[PDB]
Amino acid sequence: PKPILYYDERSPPVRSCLMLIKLLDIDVELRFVNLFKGEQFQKDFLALNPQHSVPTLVHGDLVLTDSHAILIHLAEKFDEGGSLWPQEHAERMKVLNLLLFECSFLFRRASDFMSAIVRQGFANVDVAHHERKLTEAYIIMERYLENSDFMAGPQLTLADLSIVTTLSTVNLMFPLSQFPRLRRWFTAMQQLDAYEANCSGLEKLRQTMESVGSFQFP
Amino acid sequence: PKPILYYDERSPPVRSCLMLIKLLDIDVELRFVNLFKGEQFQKDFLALNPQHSVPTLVHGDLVLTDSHAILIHLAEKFDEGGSLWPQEHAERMKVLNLLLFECSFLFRRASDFMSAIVRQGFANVDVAHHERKLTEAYIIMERYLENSDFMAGPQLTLADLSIVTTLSTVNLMFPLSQFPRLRRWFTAMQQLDAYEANCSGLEKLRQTMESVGSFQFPSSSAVVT
């Protein structure tokens, strides 16, 4: 059976998988789960994924509930011998390391910020606090780009697909003008054919956040 | 060359790597970084790992800055063909899925809770809020263990090593009375010879948190075997 992707394109990790699917021409069945209507708490989805999160991939009997596992799985199954998920161990571990940075550092802080807006309202969020936390992530990625054109080396990898969607989401609020390597990389990422898979969900998140948060991004 | 592990044993992710090293009898050079004294912000360590986090592994030219990558790299180099990081693709993806659960959900919430204690003092923390968010992680792990004997399947894997350390950390505060599968699984993990590598740093984290947070964990919560 072809893979089934439960998704809401406002989620940046969803968009990372949509970019990989477009990049590799994967035939996938999309199933929309509206996160802002709480559809991730519907009994059948909770039974499928008790973490009530998207993306969720069902591929045969395999149920994956984290975008980084989905990216790796789809690359191994549909891009064997490719460069997005390098076959050499040291290069593959460097891509793994940056995928985990995205999960544990960049996305955690992006989620902390966006969730604060939803819960407290934009007017009541400590914006300076989150600006510092996310600017630190900008600084780290700027250092990661010192020796290489991409996040994990000289070529595009799953690490770039995972990072770019969250960064574009944080970039809604905090510009990249003070980070030259990072701004050039982000501009280069926007030139990919596959980057088109990010545009629609980013704009939907922009307008959903502005309405729910009762504000407007700069 | 031999792997270098920058560590603070109070970190649950550090203890996860310490358990794998003991389970596999890997010779590693331990280099201590005191998280509570702020040695992770020293110039030399920041240059090596700008995320200023432990565990950090240096193995030859490879520098890993996340425990889950470290567990996978060590399993592939010292448990080739083993069952901790299984060779069959579907089983391996299941282990990876649970490692990312630990990173994105259990550890995220456990760190939110401990961080608040350190920053505000226990008496100013909204403990009920964190009790809810961590009980939800308990429920999810209980669900995983209803369908399988270990976290990712019928055998011990890297997912159990990653999860048990943060679980033991959360369980300093929140009891497991209502979670029989989690209790049975935790009890089994504590019988493992490798679990000795978790014991010491758990206790030191208990002592440090009580001091910095100006409180005491309820002694009745922690599961002891």
Author numbering:
A (entry chain BA): 4 to 221
B (entry chain AA): 4 to 228
Quote the study that presented this structure, word for word.
Consistent with the requirement of GSH for GST function, a defect in GSH biosynthesis in D. melanogaster also leads to larval lethality, which is partly rescued by the administration of 20E or cholesterol. These data indicate that the nobo family of GSTs is essential for ecdysteroid biosynthesis by regulating cholesterol trafficking and/or metabolism. In general, GSTs catalyze various reactions with an activated glutathione (GSH) molecule in the following three ways: GSH conjugation to a substrate, reduction of a substrate using GSH, and isomerization.
The importance of the Asp-113–EST hydrogen bond for EST binding was biochemically examined with a recombinant mutated DmNobo protein carrying D113A amino acid substitution (DmNobo D113A). In the absence of EST, both DmNobo WT and DmNobo D113A showed GSH conjugation activity although the activity of DmNobo D113A decreased by approximately half of DmNobo WT. In the presence of EST, as expected from the EST-binding to the H-site, the enzymatic activity of DmNobo WT was inhibited with an IC50 value of ∼2.3 μm. In contrast, the enzymatic activity of DmNobo D113A was not inhibited by EST, even at a concentration of 25 μm.
